[PDB]
């Protein structure tokens, strides 16, 4: 049961480079460990212009969700630190937006939730609630 009219969402786009690593979220699904590589490229469109306070207001008033264009990469298998296979997904946002998000905890939290949601629906995943920023590794895998 719910009554809200809007919710933040991934606007899936075709990845277009040049991409580069950003940061990596470790989490689990119902099936195993998952790494989400939040990457960025200038050729991913930005979200519509909005200030942090305008966006919080729209959330409070249920007048919009944050709609972030992002590519939702296909899975690639990678080894974790213990030598076990895990699934990684590369999710790219716009570079200007990424630079803004570096200076905002609020925008970062939105991106993480939205990337999780996009991958969950695209790949039929049930990510478990806990997740962690990888401190010493911006990207799980190569490139
Ligand atoms: Na809402």
Shape call:
globular
Portion of residues in beta strands equals 25-35%
Structural domains: how many: 1
Largest sheet: 7 strands, mixed
Number of β-strand runs: 7
Please write the string of helix (H) and strand (E) elements. Answer: EEEHEEEHHE
Determine Rg (CA atoms, Å). 15 Å
Class based on secondary structure composition and strand pairing: alpha/beta
Chemical compounds bound to the protein = sodium ion
Count of alpha and pi helical runs: 3
| Percentage of residues in helical conformation | 10-25%
N-C termini distance: 42 Å
PDB class: protein binding
Keywords: Protein scaffold, cytokine binding, protein binding
Assembly: monomeric
Entry title: DoBi scaffold based on PIH1D1 N-terminal domain
Short account of what is shown:
The record marks 26, 33, 82 as: Interacts with TELO2. This protein is α/β, with parallel strands linked by helices and 143 residues long. Helices cover 24% and strands 35% of the residues.
């Amino acid at each position: 049961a719910h009554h809200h009219h809007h919710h933040s969402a991934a606007l899936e786009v075709l990845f277009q480079g040049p991409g580069q690593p950003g940061f990596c979220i470790k989490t689990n699904s119902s099936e195993g460990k998952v790494f989400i590589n939040i990457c960025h490229s200038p050729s991913i469109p930005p979200p519509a212009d909005v200030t942090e306070e305008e966006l919080l207001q729209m959330l409070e008033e249920d007048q919009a969700g944050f709609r972030i264009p992002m590519s939702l990469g296909e899975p690639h298998a990678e080894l974790d630190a213990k030598g076990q296979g895990c699934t990684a997904y590369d999710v790219a946002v716009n570079s200007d937006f990424y630079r803004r998000m570096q200076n905002s905890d609020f925008l970062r939290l939105l991106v993480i939730r939205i990337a999780r949601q996009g991958l969950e629906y695209k790949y039929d995943l049930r990510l478990a609630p806990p997740w962690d920023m990888m401190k010493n590794r911006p990207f799980m895998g190569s490139i």
